[PDB]
Amino acid sequence: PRKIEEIKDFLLTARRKDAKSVKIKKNKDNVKFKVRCSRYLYTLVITDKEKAEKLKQSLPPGLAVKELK
Template sequence: MASSRPAAFPTPKQIRDIKEFIKITQRKDASQARIKKIASKVPGGKTQTKFKVRCSRYLYTLSVDDPEKADKLQQSLPPGLTVIELDKVPKKK
């Protein structure tokens, strides 16, 4: 069976290791990083931060639950990389 996605858009890759993610951001084909902070659905819960890096072939994603680690990772992104911070849009009632 053929998948519903065209071959030009391969599936995103989830990265679990922060050091591996930093290596990916330093590659030549890494063009853009998007940072999305998602508030916890439970009161008093931790904010989840998702880092997405667009490379020539794949979109790499890293999820971080610790806000301090997320800030350190954001500061360690290469200066030549375009960084876009996305805010989550609240749902309409």
């Protein structure tokens, strides 16, 4: 597993060709965005509920989204 510190590199890893899926985990005091690539599961950790919702619209349209529960 790899942790992406920034938001800008998360968009490139989601826009990779080998990004099989993206999944959103909604727990307390944290929002987790996980992109399943060929080698690693890249995780973006957001502790801002406003930026989580705008990024959720800001995902690329060609990627398959699985909102976890």
